[PDB]
């Protein structure tokens, strides 16, 4: 991922999302698009971004349904041009394998979300997260998401998935995570508000990149 | 809910979804629309259904993000005209309260998903589900989802949320759940494929209603 930095583009109107993404494009290779933007502007926004910026797109849909519904969500998402989809592990192995099967059919990839970055993740997700990660390994998952806000958890998750797996990490900036500490364990960081709410998003991106080039 | 039966409309093209929903409308009051249909046809499908059928709409989005993202997803969903949204409890209390706050602002309702109906729910969700339900009660949640496929779990969940709470239950028909047994505990059942894949969806709906009128 260019500069190890993934933009979380959670602005909800197309003109602002296009402006900010264009402004920071010299600093990123990869944009995470989630439901805030997709439910406001439509699934066609994925192909628009992919074309206009020549960026890879991760669909952050935190897929969390039964296997049959997960299969449908994944097929619609890859049809729309997404390169990868984020899938929750908490609903269990059959729900994850349904997503992996569609990704295998469509030549796409699944990111398994293990532990989440927000405080409420401590209630139920954290206690299951090591086991969710192991389940991923056992299913052949190669791409994972884990929390910038808890680098000791991010270290453990790295220890389970091994060095060859690809690990991306949200919670940097607004939620309190640090770029450099997070990159001790993750391959790339995800950053939303610290960039997209900045008075100068390009300067904010450049500042983050500076802080991690060294 | 009319006849205690909620249609899970998971067909992915608008013409088929409109046909089947129109055919079974004399038997239902309430349609659950999820991401299979919304990601294929757009969020405008919610208002279209609400107008064309004069049905209530539950947006089955199994919201499962951090509080800030959950707030956005809920606002976009209620803006599109949904009456209610299904929210996962597994990400914890702050993520649920974010949805409750937007529902309170928009005059809408949240359904808390406790235990899911598919086999993989046994891995991580089932062991947390009683505690998820209690958390709902502690947050003032009045509407819940629990599994037709495990009526002993559905009985326990009813015992936690009490008799005044409203409980809906998927997993009837295709997944193995029984309409009448499920309605010992749930106020309404959710049915998808057993209706929408039937050669005659109206006859399938009518058959289910017959089996539970007695
Ligand atoms: N995908 C995520 C997770 F798995 C997770 O555990 N925590 C997250 O924040 N996100 C997303 O990452 C972004 C964080 O944005 P920012 O805080 O503004 O920098 C948002 O899109 C979140 O929905
Ligand atoms: N909302 C759900 C849950 F919380 C859950 O635990 N299990 C489910 O199946 N659904 C949804 O209920 C419907 C079940 O559809 P059918 O099997 O064809 O009858 C689908 O839309 C599922 O996504």
UniProtKB/Swiss-Prot annotation, chains A, B:
What is this organism's lineage?
Archaea, Methanobacteriati, Methanobacteriota, Methanomada group, Methanobacteria
Q: Which reaction does it catalyse?
A: orotidine 5'-phosphate + H(+) = UMP + CO2
Record key words, sorted: Decarboxylase, Lyase, Pyrimidine biosynthesis
Q: Name one Pfam family in it.
A: OMPdecase
UniProt pathway:
Pyrimidine metabolism; UMP biosynthesis via de novo pathway; UMP from orotate: step 2/2
Q: What does this protein do?
A: Catalyzes the decarboxylation of orotidine 5'-monophosphate (OMP) to uridine 5'-monophosphate (UMP).
Tell me what organism the protein belongs to.
Methanothermobacter thermautotrophicus (strain ATCC 29096 / DSM 1053 / JCM 10044 / NBRC 100330 / Delta H) (Methanobacterium thermoautotrophicum)
Q: Subunit structure, briefly?
A: Homodimer.
Active site (record annotation): 62 (proton donor)
InterPro entries, sorted: Aldolase_TIM, OMPdecase, OMPdecase_arc, OMPdecase_AS, OMPdeCOase_dom, RibuloseP-bd_barrel
Is Lipid metabolism among the key words of this record? no
Q: What is its EC number?
A: 4.1.1.23
The record ties this protein, via CDD domains, to: OMP_decarboxylase_like
Instruction: Extract one GO BP annotation from the record.
Output: 'de novo' UMP biosynthetic process
Q: Which family does it belong to?
A: Belongs to the OMP decarboxylase family. Type 1 subfamily.
List GO terms (cellular component aspect): cytosol
What is this protein's name?
Orotidine 5'-phosphate decarboxylase
Residues binding substrate are 10, 32, 60-69, 117, 170-180, 192-193
- Asked if the keyword Transferase belongs to this entry, the reply reads no
- Source superkingdom: Archaea
Q: Which PROSITE patterns match?
A: OMPDECASE
Give the molecular function GO annotations.
orotidine-5'-phosphate decarboxylase activity
Judged by the first EC level, this protein's enzyme class is lyase
